[PDB]
Structure 1
Amino acid sequence: PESQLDLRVQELIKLICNQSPEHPLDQHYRNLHCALRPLDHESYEFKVISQYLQSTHAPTHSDYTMTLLDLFEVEKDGEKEAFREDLHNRMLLWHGSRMSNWVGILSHGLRIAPPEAPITGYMFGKGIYFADMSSKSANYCFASRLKNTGLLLLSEVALGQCNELLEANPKAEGLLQGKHSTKGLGKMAPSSAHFVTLNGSTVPLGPASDTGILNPDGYTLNYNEYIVYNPNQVRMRYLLKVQFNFLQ
């Protein structure tokens, strides 16, 4: 009958999901094995992440804006222990996805791309993909004017040593040669000057600027992507409930 979850967590669950004594909402929430605790809109963490979202909304993604409706702290049991805390270049990075995938993601954590690949391969191999531009990830939410509420995931990502690459390459994991991740280089990115620290992870705050990068061969990426090939380089921390405002 009556739910034991904060109302904000209730509405989150209604969104990504769907007589016991347990409310069916509380059932779904319990079966995620994932803490989701709402944060106060005046707290520092809300302010910083709110800024992260807005300042790293890409200039060439002007076909919409985003509003932060609700902010959540994510704590997946076991992830802190498994995490590669040893590695340097630990960044708080964006991950966007279809609505149908959030139960899976909150239930098992982020997985590397499925082993039965498409026949071309993945753009940068079988890993877990992140962005430092909020709107680059949000375009992976496949939101619409009707379905204009989506989620963005913020995660601590142990990048360690990056293998920097100018173009797409399915064999990227192989090209690592001992380094701990791939970084696909974009024409534009946040620069270290405006960077900030939140609980031991660098947060690459905007604005983005030209990186002077050009691919001498073909097409060069608009914005960076970061790829790690072991889930223990990932630790979920925040879940943003975000509103997409499409123009005209």
Structure 2
Amino acid sequence: KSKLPKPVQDLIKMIFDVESMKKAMVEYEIDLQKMPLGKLSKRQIQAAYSILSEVQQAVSQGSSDSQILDLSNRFYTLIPHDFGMKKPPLLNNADSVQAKVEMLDNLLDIEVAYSLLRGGSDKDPIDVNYEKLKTDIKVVDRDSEEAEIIRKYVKNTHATTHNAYDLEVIDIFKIEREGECQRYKPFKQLHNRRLLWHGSRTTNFAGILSQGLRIAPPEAPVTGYMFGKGIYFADMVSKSANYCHTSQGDPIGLILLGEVALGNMYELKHASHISKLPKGKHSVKGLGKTTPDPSANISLDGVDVPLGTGISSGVNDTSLLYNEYIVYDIAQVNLKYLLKLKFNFKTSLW
């Protein structure tokens, strides 16, 4: 029997849950008869991203309808969908491809989690699966100052437009991924280090913990992402928490706090599909209409914690309601905490 703290055990059961992986694929309308979890592969996912990249090129550089249509057929042949009686969406515009890009990002992480789950020994399974994460996980005391500051960050940065649910913090975990300390070392030195959120489906955490946050593969279309292929973070808990993709049918999710070394920010208000930064720049800040009150900002260890409540920023001519922060090198991030959140979905409008 495992000697791991009970919250840690429960975390392990959540992450390594085949049924949630299946639910995830069904949400993307993948036909599980034609493509079962066990038959997902990296190569298939790589080729699918290749097809989206070709699709976007064929659209940018004005290919013919026939070619666009062929590329769509190829995508849906490789990734089988069940659309019911709904018209299968042609991949002939930025919106349609961005949606498929997000599905593939999640497919990639599900493949990693299912791989990790199916690998190793068949001791307590909980301990066998814990070791697969290659991460030291400690439970933060509910009454710590550490816990209070974090509950305050959650409370204060919930955006007013994310009004469908309230968040309640169930468990807080201190995490240290094997070898990430050393990896982050050089950036430890950089100015403008910030403690920011990253939200993800619950089973994506097998890959996130074992491999860390990653940039999309070279096959993935740079145009698939608002600010290109980097690692995305929010300073508003609810903007990240939406990426948990929880529902009243499955209302517990997980979210990371990570220290990110931003340095000099390239400040942008609209899409910029970049893969590299111009010289002088270490990150992108996408500027939101709403920004945490910088009066309320705290800092420890030279890291800023933007836990002020949201106030109007200077900015009105923007594509974003809230800020977002992108780095283009995986070493720029050091994961600090992992929070287990219950999403309490609202029944009243008042």
Q: Which of the five TM-score ranges fits, normalised by the shorter chain?
A: over 0.9
Max Rg structure: 2
Q: CA deviation at 1:80?
A: 1.1
Q: What does residue 220 of structure 2 align with?
A: 117
Q: What does residue 183 of structure 1 align with?
A: 285
Q: What does residue 207 of structure 1 align with?
A: 309
- Alignment equivalent of 1:61, drawn from 138, 149, 162: 162
- Alignment equivalent of 2:339, drawn from 224, 240, 245: 240
Q: CA deviation at 1:99?
A: 1.6
Matching of residues 1-248 of structure 1 within 5 Å: 2-18=1-17, 22-83=123-184, 84-118=187-221, 120-171=223-274, 173-215=275-317, 220-248=319-347
CA RMSD of aligned residues (A): 1.5
Could you report, residue by residue, the CA deviation over 1:154-188 in whole angstroms, capped at 9, with x for unpaired residues?
A: 000000000000101112x4453331000100000
CA distance in 2, matches of 1:232, 1:136: 23
Q: Which has the higher strand share?
A: 1
CA distance in 2, matches of 1:15, 1:94: 20
Q: CA deviation at 1:122?
A: 1.5
Q: CA deviation at 1:97?
A: 0.6
Could you report, residue by residue, the CA deviation over 1:75-124 in whole angstroms, capped at 9, with x for unpaired residues?
A: 01211111111111000000001122110000011101232224743210
In the alignment, is the contact (CA less than 8 A) between 1:163 and 1:179 conserved in 2?
yes
The 3 A distance-change label for structure 1 pair 21 and 169 is closer
Unaligned runs of 5+ in 1: none
Secondary structure in structure 2 of the residue aligned to 1:105: helix
Q: What does residue 106 of structure 2 align with?
A: none
Secondary structure in structure 1 of the residue aligned to 2:270: coil
Q: CA deviation at 1:142?
A: 0.3
In the alignment, is the contact (CA less than 8 A) between 1:176 and 1:182 conserved in 2?
no
The 3 A distance-change label for structure 1 pair 43 and 15 is same
TM-score w.r.t. structure 2 length?
0.67
Q: CA deviation at 1:42?
A: 0.3
The 3 A distance-change label for structure 1 pair 45 and 109 is same
In the alignment, is the contact (CA less than 8 A) between 2:294 and 2:308 conserved in 1?
no
Aligned length: 242
**Higher relative contact order, chain-length normalized (CA < 8 Å, sep 6+):** 1
Greater than 4 Å deviation, 4+ residue runs: none
CA distance in 2, matches of 1:17, 1:27: 11
CA distance in 2, matches of 1:242, 1:199: 26
The 3 A distance-change label for structure 1 pair 174 and 77 is closer
CA distance in 1, matches of 2:193, 2:163: 29
Q: What does residue 24 of structure 2 align with?
A: none
In the alignment, is the contact (CA less than 8 A) between 1:67 and 1:243 conserved in 2?
yes
Q: What does residue 53 of structure 2 align with?
A: none
Aligned amino acid, residue 10 of structure 2: E
In the alignment, is the contact (CA less than 8 A) between 2:291 and 2:313 conserved in 1?
yes
Secondary structure in structure 2 of the residue aligned to 1:192: coil
CA distance in 2, matches of 1:198, 1:46: 15
Secondary structure in structure 1 of the residue aligned to 2:243: coil
CA distance in 1, matches of 2:338, 2:126: 18
Aligned amino acid, residue 210 of structure 1: S
In the alignment, is the contact (CA less than 8 A) between 2:222 and 2:228 conserved in 1?
no
Aligned amino acid, residue 231 of structure 1: I
Q: Which has the higher helix share?
A: 2
CA distance in 2, matches of 1:119, 1:158: 22
Secondary structure in structure 1 of the residue aligned to 2:189: coil
Q: CA deviation at 1:243?
A: 0.3
CA distance in 2, matches of 1:158, 1:126: 17
CA distance in 1, matches of 2:323, 2:304: 16
In the alignment, is the contact (CA less than 8 A) between 1:151 and 1:239 conserved in 2?
yes
Secondary structure in structure 2 of the residue aligned to 1:124: coil
In the alignment, is the contact (CA less than 8 A) between 2:153 and 2:237 conserved in 1?
yes
CA distance in 2, matches of 1:221, 1:194: 22
